[PDB]
Amino acid sequence: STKNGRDSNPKMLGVKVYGGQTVTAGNIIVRQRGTEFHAGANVGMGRDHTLFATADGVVKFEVKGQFGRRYVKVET
Amino acid sequence: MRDKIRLVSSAGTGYFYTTTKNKRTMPEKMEIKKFDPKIRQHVIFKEAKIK
RNA sequence: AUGAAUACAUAGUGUUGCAAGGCGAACGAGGGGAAGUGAAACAUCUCAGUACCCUUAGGAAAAGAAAUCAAUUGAGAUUCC
RNA sequence: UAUAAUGGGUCAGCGACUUAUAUUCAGUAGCGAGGUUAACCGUAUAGGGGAGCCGUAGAGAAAUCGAGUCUUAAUAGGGCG
RNA sequence: GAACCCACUGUCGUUGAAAAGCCAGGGGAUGACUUGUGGAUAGGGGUGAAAGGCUAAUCAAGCCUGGUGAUAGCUGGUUCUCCCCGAAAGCUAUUUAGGUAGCGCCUCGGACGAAUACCAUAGGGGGUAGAGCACUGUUUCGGCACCGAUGCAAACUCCGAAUACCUAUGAGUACUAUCCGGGAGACAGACUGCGGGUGCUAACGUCCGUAGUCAAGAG
RNA sequence: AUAGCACUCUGCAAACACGAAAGUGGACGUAUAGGGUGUGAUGCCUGCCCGGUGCUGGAAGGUUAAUUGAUGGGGUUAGCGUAAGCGAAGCUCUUGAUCGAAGCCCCAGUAAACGGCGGCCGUAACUAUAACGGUCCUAAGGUAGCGAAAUUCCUUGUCGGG
RNA sequence: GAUGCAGUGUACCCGCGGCUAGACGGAAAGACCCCGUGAACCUUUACUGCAGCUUGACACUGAACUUUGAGGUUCUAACUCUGUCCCGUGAUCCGGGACGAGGACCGUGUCUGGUGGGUAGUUUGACUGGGGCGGUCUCCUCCUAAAGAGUAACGGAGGAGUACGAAGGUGCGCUCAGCGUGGUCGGAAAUCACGCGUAGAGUAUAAAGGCAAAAGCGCGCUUAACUGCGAGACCCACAAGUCGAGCAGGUACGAAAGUAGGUCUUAGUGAUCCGGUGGUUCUGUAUGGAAGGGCCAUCGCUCAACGGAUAAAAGGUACUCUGGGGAUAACAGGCUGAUACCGCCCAAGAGUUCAUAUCGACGGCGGUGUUUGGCACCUCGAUGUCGGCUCAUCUCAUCCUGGGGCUGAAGCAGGUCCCAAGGGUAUGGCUGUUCGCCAUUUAAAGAGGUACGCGAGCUGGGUUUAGAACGUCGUGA
RNA sequence: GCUGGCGACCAUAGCAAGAGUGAACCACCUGAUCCCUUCCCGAACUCAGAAGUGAAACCUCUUAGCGCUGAUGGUAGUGUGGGAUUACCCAUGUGAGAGUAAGUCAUCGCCAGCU
């Protein structure tokens, strides 16, 4: 009899809206366990590190700053 | 583990909150300031039996 | 009419007269009364007061003239649709 | 499945999606903001019988309101319309 | 040891002469013996020197008639003709696993038309193939844990494609996409190629992903 | 199955069995009798354990039923209050004190009642063994007799006979 | 596992007597095995009732004297007699009468506690490379998983069924770990001081994704671990689950811009029904109340078989039965060849010297389809056998006989390899044996395939029905 | 041309080494009276000021030492069609990682002082 045989239910993480798409305020952009992406302009961060839009516009990804963090912002 | 307790409004409205507490570390009855929607003010709430 | 224990009686015994018993469709009234089944198992529950057993009428039976309902103070005995 | 998996020795005759009620949808006919009677009466498929049913208004657990209504301290917001 | 009552062995018989026998041997044969006639015990009951034996060729609950057309997620069967479309053997849950229910897939009616798809161009995230040793482990040889050479990794990564996926614009081609309703069937799959787990880089083996064919398709 | 043996129940309107009851068998019998249970002529015999379950006999402590209904808490309204409200009696809902048997808990006996009958290490002048000891745990750790057996896996054990 | 398909060989048409190798021959919807939320009967310290037995209260049920509500003594009149006598009456039933012995006991009705396999109805999960035994059943993390999501196995590895009134909020403030130098006890490593290089520390807890405006670490004040909501999204069969700007009220910390709707995040959980508690400008069976119900908040689950069939449930069947399955096991066939058997390559060494006369270590490559297995494709509306008997047929990896090469071949013998399938190739003791051991033979007593050849050709000793016993297991069947 | 503040950008821009700067600015600097401060300490934070020094620090310049950037070509992988099954070959499209040549001691913006 094996001592293995367990696993957890899937969580369905990942990028939900890609660069160049238009969003409405409140749209979820990234589901992530940790801050793989950071919130830029017009983007808010939830209690579970979810990134969402706070304004209408076009999503844009970039690499910026002195640490080389990945940012996602919304351009109005 | 941790026992369930009610915090009852001192204003006499009958409003209450529910929480848990460790008896061994907190033997005394708990008092804390909370909002009472019945009178729309902050008042002191006191521990009582959850029953 | 006769006639014990037992005195009076009563019980018991006999004669005469009258009546009853049995059978047969369904329907009626009453006395008893299952399980298969369903619940996707099963015990509460259901099946169902059904099947069946028993007693007993009539052309029908049962019920019936409010110690009943109703709720503007009104209706007005049973039975069936 | 040629299968060495099932069934049929052969012929003739019989042999299996029904009936009642309710409900929903589609066709078709009448009438149409209206439609329609049931039991029952009726020498009776007629003609009577409007009790009742469906539609015509929603919201709310409900009291209640009503093109609004519920929630709320709120004419804010939101849900059903 | 005959009659009578039994049934230990063997051949035969087994669509028999016989639904338990014949033949040759065998046991008891004044006893707890055998037997006629007539009675008693009735079904969760009877009777049993006890084998669950016997109770009318029937017994772990007799037979007959009723409840009764018991129930059966199981097996079988289901009858004339032509035309159009055409599946699935998956996910989720289930005292569920060969049943069923919601969704996925089929069909018919209505509404609505370019909102759809193929391809091109443009924008976007990645951590696989490969590779590497910068971390985590592991490996060999030197020099003094470190330094120099040298390998390995599904649960290592300093790196990192092709494809696939999402969005916008556009030509051409095509009855496309979507919404609201009536009716389903199906939830046992198989092989082959490619990427893998398991198995011995076994199996016409087993479990996933992906495409084709069969299933339901003849030449 | 049996004669023989043993245990146990039964004082007679017997125990026990059939039956719903009436009643019937037991038995027109009476403990030298009748029922139940086990063993199975006869010979020699029948060891230890009452912790468990059962049976028998005690004990009156703890626990417990129906019944009983002391207390406490509500509902209602005469009345009293400007009011908020208070509020007897009478009905009524509920709470439940006290009393209350057997059984059970407890204590003894009982195995021809159902049942049970163990382990780990040492030790005598050659060797070996262990008369003999060290202990742990039970209610108690197999007496007589028998033993590769209708019982023995290893196993066709080993030795003798044929 | 083919009379019927392919290729090919053979074969004029039809009887009769024989025979049983095949027609997976006929016979009985397999009895073994599994399945169905099938059946029956049996058992018990399974569940739940009932009969029977037993306890107490009330009723039938009365009287008079004593003692500390209860106990004792006496009585007769209820009631008992399967005791005697009389009568009905020609009668061991029954009824009435007279006695005698008992007697408010016994016994019966209603209620009530106990006991209760005597009897009755039922239950006793699923997954599963057959079933059983073992393991597992819900949630979180990583890999498998093929660079979006998702993705299975009784695949490979670990965690959870909590904790915290601060370990929450806010304002202000601060950086770890390691190594080296010196410094009392004091050092491998306690604390102090200065450097060096460097995220290797930490984050309540497993792992992963994260963490400088540190999400890590301190101090003061505090309760936003608030109430009403909520545009818009993620995920999704449903039921559920997740993120959320912003508006209003009341707060806390800041000088302020501001931050705060618990904790870096992802596990720490349970639907509905039925009940308890607080509140309530809802309802209230004539009316006013009330009881009860509704609404808001909240409490009672290892219902862990974790979408939870009941409030409540274990076993046996060889005495058995039905509906099904070759969807699924035991025999034989099939695929495979780990295992098995046979062969070959390299060659340390052994062989007095001498790898290869004969052996041959450590390693490597194949063949066959006699073993043990793996799979579950055929057969469960039946393919019905362990051994022996009778009768066979084929292969060659040859046991004897025949022909050869080499030799550590003097001869006689022997060893090893090659060719060769024509024929031949024991009887007995023991045991059911196949096998095996033993005795005595023979030139030799070969190894295998043929449904482990052959039971519509024979047997039936073994195995595997129903009877009985022993050892052992079980309370018991 | 020097100095200060705030940004863009985040190594071709960084580290390391060497050398320079005092008019103004900045930095050390004085001590601690009142503000304020240390789980001790005027070390930091804070106040009130210029007796000294550019020593340290910060800035500026030089160096390819460490580091970083990095072609071309080839190789690996891979979508589609075909041919094979130790995982290759062909046609077509695509194309790394490592390494080699080589490059680098950044480049811009706003405001204010001093010449």
Automatic annotation (TrEMBL), chain B:
<keyword id="KW-0687">Ribonucleoprotein</keyword>
<dbReference type="InterPro" id="IPR018264">
    <property type="entry name" value="Ribosomal_bL33_CS"/>
</dbReference>
<dbReference type="InterPro" id="IPR011332">
    <property type="entry name" value="Ribosomal_zn-bd"/>
</dbReference>
<dbReference type="GO" id="GO:0022625">
    <property type="term" value="C:cytosolic large ribosomal subunit"/>
</dbReference>
<keyword id="KW-0689">Ribosomal protein</keyword>
<protein>
    <recommendedName>
        <fullName>Large ribosomal subunit protein bL33</fullName>
    </recommendedName>
</protein>
<comment type="similarity">
    <text>Belongs to the bacterial ribosomal protein bL33 family.</text>
</comment>
<dbReference type="Pfam" id="PF00471">
    <property type="entry name" value="Ribosomal_L33"/>
</dbReference>
<dbReference type="GO" id="GO:0006412">
    <property type="term" value="P:translation"/>
</dbReference>
<dbReference type="InterPro" id="IPR001705">
    <property type="entry name" value="Ribosomal_bL33"/>
</dbReference>
<dbReference type="GO" id="GO:0003735">
    <property type="term" value="F:structural constituent of ribosome"/>
</dbReference>
<dbReference type="InterPro" id="IPR038584">
    <property type="entry name" value="Ribosomal_bL33_sf"/>
</dbReference>
